[PDB]
Symmetry: C2
Subunit: 384 residues, 2 copies
Amino acid sequence: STGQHPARYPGAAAGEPTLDSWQEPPHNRWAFAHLGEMVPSAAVSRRPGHALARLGAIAAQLPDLEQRLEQTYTDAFLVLRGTEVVAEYYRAGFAPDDRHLLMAVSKSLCGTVVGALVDEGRIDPAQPVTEYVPELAGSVYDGPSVLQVLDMQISIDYNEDYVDPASEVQTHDRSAGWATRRHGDPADTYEFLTTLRGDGSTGEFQYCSANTDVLAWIVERVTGLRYVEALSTYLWAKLDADRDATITVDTTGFGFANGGVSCTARDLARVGRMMLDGGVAPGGRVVSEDWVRRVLAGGSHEAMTDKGFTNTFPDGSYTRQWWCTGNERGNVSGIGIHGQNLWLDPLTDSVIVKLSSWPDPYTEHWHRLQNGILLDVSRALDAV
Amino acid sequence: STGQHPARYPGAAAGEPTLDSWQEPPHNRWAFAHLGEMVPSAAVSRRPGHALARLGAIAAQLPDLEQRLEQTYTDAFLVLRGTEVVAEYYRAGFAPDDRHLLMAVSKSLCGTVVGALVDEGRIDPAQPVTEYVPELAGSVYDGPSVLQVLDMQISIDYNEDYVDPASEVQTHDRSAGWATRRHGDPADTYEFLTTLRGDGSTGEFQYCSANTDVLAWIVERVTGLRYVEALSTYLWAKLDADRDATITVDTTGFGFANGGVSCTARDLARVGRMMLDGGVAPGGRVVSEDWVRRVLAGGSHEAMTDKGFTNTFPDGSYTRQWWCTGNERGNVSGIGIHGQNLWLDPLTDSVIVKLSSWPDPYTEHWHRLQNGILLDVSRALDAV
Ligand SMILES: NCCCCCC(=O)O
Ligand SMILES: NCCCCCC(=O)O
């Protein structure tokens, strides 16, 4: 058992509705107004082909930028300097207002929600996960603190060999609805998390998407709100965004916090703007000045043993769901597979959003090219 | 085999991507920008509880209208007189701009798309279905004309006992993704349609949702466009709608034409406005004056043997995916289970939209109450 979870709608029974009951009362009143949450759906455009390149200023300093963006399968690219959009690019077939999957950049958004609750005193990072989710007792999350989840410093037996159906990464997807279910799989994401084990050691960084979903679960237990709603109330609704964001949900309606959020490039930039504004957004304060300061400061360097990151950023680290380069510019970034970045350049008070679709989720090749672009663009914003 | 179908994206292989391949190239470029079409997803509101009742004028003539709307589980109600919104109502929890499932009102939209193609001369209603979908040879659709599909005058062995998994109505849902698949079920909607049989007789009305999906299939074969896109190009994109509409899609990306469209009440009214404007919309002509005239004229009365309809509307009929009351006002309406109506009142140049969630899909009780409201509101618009 995974305990109490926020009802899909007021008064809903546990797990209701399902794909086989949404047409029945009392579920249908809610379902008829939110069918996309139950059945895959397509948009029928209200609007009646070519790449849009408005690199403006930085174009002079980076003449071959558009070609570099194409080479890195860029779908949407946007540079926000201060409160102004100084550069934009969208591939042919992708409109400026189209939404794009954020993959793990979603984690940085989740960490932000957790930070908001810490600022309210509803979550104490020093407390064990079990203080908020008792049902995680007996799992690898029995013992570690919420901060250790936030910094991903928990050793977990997490097979990353996706090709293997028995692997935790593929099992995670099947439990959440990102892949076809197999007989015996956990019923939902909550159940999947309870099956995770580890040797008990903590302190060393181990990137694991399950950590973010545990954070979302904690958010639900502390607020009583579905993660989908908490993400809106504590973050999205305060950004004065152009469009709603979306997030995939599993069979119980639990949002895939670790990587299922989609939004426009311009709106994602609003998240970066909030971070560079000390945690304040147009709709009010999202997180405390201290929270933002700690994110920019970085995590323990000694905990960061991922050569894939440190070979490029030797003094890099990770904290509160953000990757910290530790470079001379103090760059910090939300990162997602296939080329997604919510890159912060505090030196120039700028935010760089790059949403892509590399053929591969991760290769040294793509990252070298991607980081080269982000660093070059950041430097092009420097006063000269 | 069901033959050629519009690719999910340019150059896509048949049936690609699937829930298990969308993260792979070359599918991911498209999938990352349209994930809702693959995995159930929820909206994360950009906006930070009580029913909204603005019945205005008709309120004086119908004092207990709000109570009547509540009694019929009304979610959204809107009256458009001419080009003006003269009355509105939205239940607590449903915003004016929220979208609502249309159920079979979706059929009237599909019929409109077919009409647009008839006006272009790309579809001849007198031609047999097999002229456009040869793969339907050997099925109940082998012999009947496209017009007979439009008017639903084809005898089909269609078990309406949903509770029975072997029934065609439940099988239709499972084949399209509206319900959980069972071993042995057709792979997609196209395949399901090819399994349908009948005694060969035609001429008598038999309401069958499979007919509308055959129309959508014909639309795809004649245009080369996914039904989702054809619905936009030939109808939605010409309405100057406030929001995109949505439509559930099966595993191949085929829109559930018979009942999976969702849209706002105000935008649905734009469809009615187009009909009362002789087939013309703000973005251009949608269907011919003749098509609209034939819809308002009604179908053969003798073909209409559904007592559920004729007990209320003795001179009623059905044609081109619209229900024609044949009453003294010449009312015609798109109708969907659980209380959905796109009601046309040509006498007052008005359109009445009522989107609801009755606990039951259909009962004489609900229809009596629902029609009573639509007729009373129509009469309240008469000059006095
Ligand atoms: N297994 C779902 C993928 C989650 C995204 C992971 C990442 O972007 O690093
Ligand atoms: N089997 C899917 C339901 C389709 C709606 C039918 C109707 O509204 O009459």
